[PDB]
C-alpha cells in the first residue's frame, strides 16, 4: 500500500499502425492488474513479459473511468487542504495529452455535463466547483500553466510580455520544500466553464513557442496547477481555513544532442525521486532537476501521487512499450502474482 | 555517381500529423534539387539544414512522374540486356511501398490506362509487354519475390512449402559476381496485368509468415525481380539475343537503424560512388544477392522517402543524412 500509485493505460490502434500491417502484442487484464507483451523475434511466439501495477486500463477504457479510479481519491485529499500531483508518462502518440486534457470532438455547445472525451484537467475543475458549491464552502480558484523546455520555464498564460523571456525560479526564505517562480501568471477561475477558454489561451501560446523556438509539446513538460483557498463554517463547530493544490503533469515524450539529453535526464531524475519516495530512502534527489524542484512542495509533505503510463498495443512500437513498462516498474516495484 | 542516382520523395501530411497541429519543417525545391529542414525556431534558430540530390520530389508529385523520371531510363537499359536495381529507403509510413508497387483504386480500373495509384512494379511490367510486342521481339518474362528478415530468406511465391522454410544461397560457378538461390520460384508471366494476381499471392504468403513466424513486413526487405529473355530479328540487320533483369527493392523501415544490413547497403553505395578499392557486397545477404547488379554496366537508383511534419523530424533528418552519405553532392551557392 502507498500514497504513490502507478497505473497503465493502453490506447487502441491508430491508422499508421494498421497501414504498416502491425499486429497486437499487448494483453491487458484489469482484474489481475497485469499487462503482458509478446516480445518474440523470428519464430518466437512463446515469449511474453508480464508486469503488475496498481491498476491496468485496456484500449476500451473510457475517460470517465480513468477519472473515477485515479483522480477522485486524490481530489478528496486536495479539498482537505493538501498538495498532490498526477503524471502522464509515455511515448509520443500513446495518449498523455488525451488523458490529461482530453478533447471536445466536433458537435457544438456543451450543456453542463462533461464531454465524454474530456480529460483530467477539465473534469477536475468541474468537480471542484460542483463539490464546493454544493456544500456551502467559501472558496476561490486560481490556476497556472508553465512549460519546461530545454530546462527553461515558460509561462503559457501570461497575456502580454509573451515573446520568449524565461521565468526565474529560486528558493524563497521560508520553511524548506518550496520554491518561488516570480512573474508566473495566476488566472482566477470564476465558473466551471471558464476552464476551456483558459486552456485555449494556453494552447495558442504553446503553438507560438513551438513554431518560433521549436519548443514542441512532444519535447516538453507541461505543468498545470490549480490552487484552492477554502474557508468553511458550521454553527457550533468552529471555522476552518484550508488551501489545496493539485499539479497535473503532461511529461515530454519518453522516446538535437543535449535537447534530448536533458529530457532523458529530467525523466530519469523523476524516476529516482519516485522510487525513493516509495522505498522511504531518506533524501530524494529533488534538486537534481528543474521538474522535481518545482514539484518538491508537492511530493514531500505527504500526499497522494500517481503516475499514468500510456502505451501502444502495436508490434511496431515493441521497443518503446517495453521501455515504458520498465520505467514504470522501476518507479514502484510490485511482484507478479501466481497462476499466470 | 553518374550511374548511381539518389533522389528524395517527400509525402503529403497525414491525418495524425494534421490532428496534432504538426509543423511543416521540410521545404523541397525541385528546380535547385535541394531539401531544407528547419531545426531552429525561426526567432533564434541554429539555421536550417540544406541537402542536395539528383532529384527532389515534393508532396504533390504523382506516381507517373516518378516513373517517367526514375524508371524509364533504367528500363531502357534493362531491355538492352543489362541488370539494374531500384531501392525505396525510409521510415515506416513515408511511402516506400506506395512508391514501389502502389495501390489500386477501390473501383473502376479502366482497363487500358494505368491506375493512377499504380507504383513502379505494375507500370514496369505493363511497359515491358507493350514495348516488346510493338517492335515484334520474340520474348518471355518471369518474376520472383522474396523477403529478407533478420538475415533469413523466405520465398513469397512458392505455393507449397511451409512458412518456416528458408532458402539457401550458393556461389554460382559460372560467375563470381552471381549467386544461386536454390529452389527459388520463378513464375512465368503470360500477359500484362497478370502482375496483380502474382502480387496478391505474395502478399498472402507474407501475411502467413508474419502470423506464424513474426516476420513483420515493416521490419523486412522485399526483393521483386523480373527477368526478360529477348531475341530481336531484323532482315538486313543483326539478330540479337538478350537477357535483361530488373530488381525492385522495398527496404525495411529505416527507424530500424538503432540489423546492420541497411548500413552495409549504405557503405556499398558510398563505395561505388566514390570508386573506393573494395565494395563490401559480401557483408550482408541483401548486397550479395544484388551484387550482379550494382556491378558491371548498370544504372542504380535509390528513392528516399520522408515526412514533412515536426512529429517525424528525427527520422527525417536521419534519412536525409543516410541519403547524403550514400552519395554526397555539394550545395550550390546560397545564390
Ligand atoms: N485512450 C485513448 N482513447 C482514444 N484515443 C486515444 C487514446 N490515447 C491516445 N489516443 C489518440 O492518439 C492521438 C495522440 O495522443 P495525444 O495524447 O496527442 O498525444 P501524446 O500521446 O503524445 O500525449 C490522439 O489524437 C487520440 O485520438
Ligand atoms: N507520395 C505519396 N503520395 C500519396 N500517398 C502517400 C505518399 N507517401 C505516403 N503516402 C500514404 O502514406 C502511407 C504510407 O504507407 P506505405 O505506403 O505503406 O509506406 P511505408 O512503406 O514506407 O510503410 C499510405 O497510406 C500512403 O497512401
Ligand atoms: Mg502530448
Ligand atoms: Mg511498406
From Swiss-Prot, chain B:
Q: What subcellular locations does the record give?
A: Cytoplasm; Cytoplasm, Cytoskeleton, Spindle pole
Report which superkingdom the organism of origin falls in: Eukaryota
Where N6-acetyllysine occurs along the chain? 131
Give residue ranges for domain Kinesin motor: 3-329
Q: Provide the disease association from the record.
A: Microcephaly with or without chorioretinopathy, lymphedema, or impaired intellectual development: An autosomal dominant disorder that involves an overlapping but variable spectrum of central nervous system and ocular developmental anomalies. Microcephaly ranges from mild to severe and is often associated with mild to moderate developmental delay and a characteristic facial phenotype with upslanting palpebral fissures, broad nose with rounded tip, long philtrum with thin upper lip, prominent chin, and prominent ears.
Q: What does this protein do?
A: Motor protein required for establishing a bipolar spindle and thus contributing to chromosome congression during mitosis. Required in non-mitotic cells for transport of secretory proteins from the Golgi complex to the cell surface.
Instruction: Report what the protein is called.
Output: Kinesin-like protein KIF11
Task: Give the organism, scientific name.
Answer: Homo sapiens (Human)
- The primary gene name is KIF11
| Part of the whole protein covered | 16 to 365 of 1056
